[PDB]
Amino acid sequence: HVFIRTELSFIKNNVPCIRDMFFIYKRELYNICLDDDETHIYVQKKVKDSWITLNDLFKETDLTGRPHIFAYVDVEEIIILLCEDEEKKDMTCHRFYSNDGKEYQNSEITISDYILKDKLLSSYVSLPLKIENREYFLICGVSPYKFK
Amino acid sequence: KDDILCMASHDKGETWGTKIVIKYDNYKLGVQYFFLRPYISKNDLSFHFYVGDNINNVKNVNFIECTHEKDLEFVCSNRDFLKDNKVLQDVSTLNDEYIVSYGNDNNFAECYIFFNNENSILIKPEKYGQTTAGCYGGTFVKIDEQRTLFIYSSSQGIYNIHTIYYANYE
């Protein structure tokens, strides 16, 4: 009937990350770390006991501030998106693609009049959502009520 | 009038022209959601986010489940995970059953993990030294239908990784 098991391992990180972001890829464990003067967006991997910086995606960008991050892990493919924090009317982002977790391939895109014009967003990892024979990745946002 | 809104892509992020509508017919007006994120597994869409419209100004997790109407329009609904003497934290699923994370109080001296609201495990993080180590920010990182990690940073630099196996039969 019931089987429950618990183990504890420790990991140290070179980088004191402002925000951690965890994903499993090929049963390896990967992190998207964020330090912050000076800033980076490091793609890291746990080989046992320590994280290992594999990429800096911030470098390959014309990106002025701190972006929202939307990561998506299909089984074979990893797709990450760095989206500039508003505040125009359309939103630009830079995406990175791998099928291997080591070598991420640059790019840049723009969504004009994008649907989330006045929505607040925050970074997250996710999976494709099957909706009648189609896979969709979602970027979702919330209405701004608190006075600013 | 929909408080939550998703733009969506079926071309693996090339274009974001698709629009997914989220009717969360909630009772309250003008309530700010924080740190919203969709929890997705197989067919099911759900959302995990915070609200702070309570006495203490402390933020509080809400988790809403959604089912389907149109090909792009979902209908969501709050899921009760309230639990006396504990505070709702993170949410995941092992094998079409919820696994749920809780703190003892809002200061996460301890974290309890509940399986299908039916069995539970206690996580008492060890101290980093002279200062208290909590499990603030503990989240789930799912591996497959029997295994998930529960990670949190006791203090800066230090990553506490709980490897968890669970299986319920019959």
Numbering used by the authors:
A (entry chain A): 32 to 67, 73 to 123, 128 to 188
B (entry chain E): 193 to 362
Sentences copied from the publication:
Sequencing and annotation of the P. falciparum genome has supported the identification of new blood-stage vaccine candidate antigens, among which the P. falciparum Cysteine-Rich Protective Antigen (PfCyRPA) has a number of noteworthy properties. PfCyRPA is part of a multi-protein complex including also the PfRH5-interacting protein PfRipr and the reticulocyte binding-like homologous protein PfRH5, which binds to the erythrocyte receptor basigin. Moreover, PfCyRPA-specific monoclonal antibodies (mAb) inhibit parasite growth both in vitro and in vivo by blocking merozoite invasion. Here, we describe the crystal structure of the promising vaccine candidate PfCyRPA alone and in complex with the antigen-binding fragment (Fab) of the parasite growth inhibitory mAb c12.
In order to crystallize PfCyRPA, we needed to pre-treat the protein with Actinase E. The crystal structure of PfCyRPA, determined to a resolution of 2.5 Å (detailed in Supplementary file 1), confirmed our biophysical analyses. PfCyRPA adopts a six-bladed β-propeller structure that buries the disulfide bonds and the Trp residues. Each blade of the propeller is constructed by a four-stranded anti-parallel β-sheet. The five disulfide bonds in PfCyRPA are located within blades 2–6, stabilizing each individual blade. The first blade has no disulfide bond; it is formed by β-strands from the N- and C-terminal regions of PfCyRPA, potentially enabling conformational changes in PfCyRPA by opening and closing. A domain alignment search (DALI; [Holm and Rosenström, 2010]) for related structures revealed that PfCyRPA adopts a heavily modified sialidase/neuraminidase fold. The closest structural relative is the catalytic domain of Vibrio cholerae sialidase. Two molecules of PfCyRPA are present in the asymmetric unit and have conformational differences in several surface loops, suggesting possible flexibility of these loops in solution. PfCyRPA contains none of the residues necessary for catalysis, nor does it harbor a Ca2+ binding site, providing structural correlates of the absence of sialidase activity in PfCyRPA.
